[PDB]
Design a binder for this molecule. Structure first.
Ligand SMILES: Nc1nc2c(ncn2[C@@H]2O[C@@H]3COP(=O)(O)O[C@H]4[C@@H](O)[C@H](n5cnc6c(=O)[nH]c(N)nc65)O[C@@H]4COP(=O)(O)O[C@H]3[C@H]2O)c(=O)[nH]1
Ligand SMILES: Nc1nc2c(ncn2[C@@H]2O[C@@H]3COP(=O)(O)O[C@H]4[C@@H](O)[C@H](n5cnc6c(=O)[nH]c(N)nc65)O[C@@H]4COP(=O)(O)O[C@H]3[C@H]2O)c(=O)[nH]1
Length: 163
């Protein structure tokens, strides 16, 4: 009874290091000297708030944070940036969501998408991931390519291959 796990992981310590290093980089940049510019990781909600004084400077901070994150092994696709920036007072900010684990809403689409493929596999939501089982190892490879090549909004890896 072959099975594997569909997971979406980011080492949160590496993320914190990226933020820490993005902050040290902003403090060196003299286009930001004496400019309100902050990057704060909320480790409860898996979110990074980046705030500055213009929407242009917010994107500058996001690009710095993404560069630092990539070097720590975290890919830009793991940092969900919402459509709307917030204009509050003389500040601009956005809450960027770190896509660690597969949220309930995305698990449903993965399970639905696997259903509509007609492959003889079962897909069971388990904690923060999806276990997939079936009798054919090759059908199990087809769902990997199906998930890989989906636009699901997030990187996935596959772990825990069992027979
Ligand atoms: N982008 C920008 N920010 C400004 C400006 N003026 C003041 N600030 C901000 O306000 C901080 C304190 O300025 P300060 O009281 O004169 O206290 C400063 C000041 O006494 C001196 N300093 C730094 N740069 C200069 C300079 O270019 N000329 C002179 N005469 N002193 C400087 O060293 C202190 C610490 O400097 P900072 O750490 O950078 O921290 C500075 C800086 O972040 C400005 O014209 N442009
Ligand atoms: N002679 C040979 N043919 C192979 C081999 N690997 C795949 N195939 C052939 O290709 C079919 C589909 O392979 P499967 O996806 O792994 O889907 C297989 C596999 O997942 C499982 N299975 C069957 N025999 C074995 C086995 O001996 N060891 C393991 N671990 N699984 C097996 O049952 C499925 C249907 O087996 P059948 O139908 C298999 C078999 O006809 C191989 O190593 N040697």
């Amino acid at each position: 009874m072959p099975s594997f796990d569909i997971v979406s992981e980011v080492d949160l310590q590496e993320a914190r290091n990226g933020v820490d290093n993005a902050v040290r980089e902003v403090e060196s940049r003299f286009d930001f000297r004496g400019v309100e510019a902050t990057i704060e990781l909320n480790d409860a909600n898996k979110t990074i708030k980046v705030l500055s004084e213009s929407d242009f400077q917010v994107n500058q901070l996001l690009d710095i944070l993404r560069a630092k994150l990539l070097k720590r092994g975290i890919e830009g696709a793991s940092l969900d940036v919402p459509d709307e920036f917030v204009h509050s007072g003389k500040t601009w900010y956005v809450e960027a969501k770190l896509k660690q684990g597969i949220e309930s809403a995305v698990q449903k689409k993965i399970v639905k998408l696997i259903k509509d493929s007609k492959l003889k596999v079962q897909a069971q939501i388990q904690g923060e991931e999806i276990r997939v089982t079936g009798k054919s190892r090759d059908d199990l490879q087809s769902v990997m390519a199906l998930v890989r090549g989906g636009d699901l909004g997030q990187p996935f890896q596959f772990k825990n291959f069992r027979d």
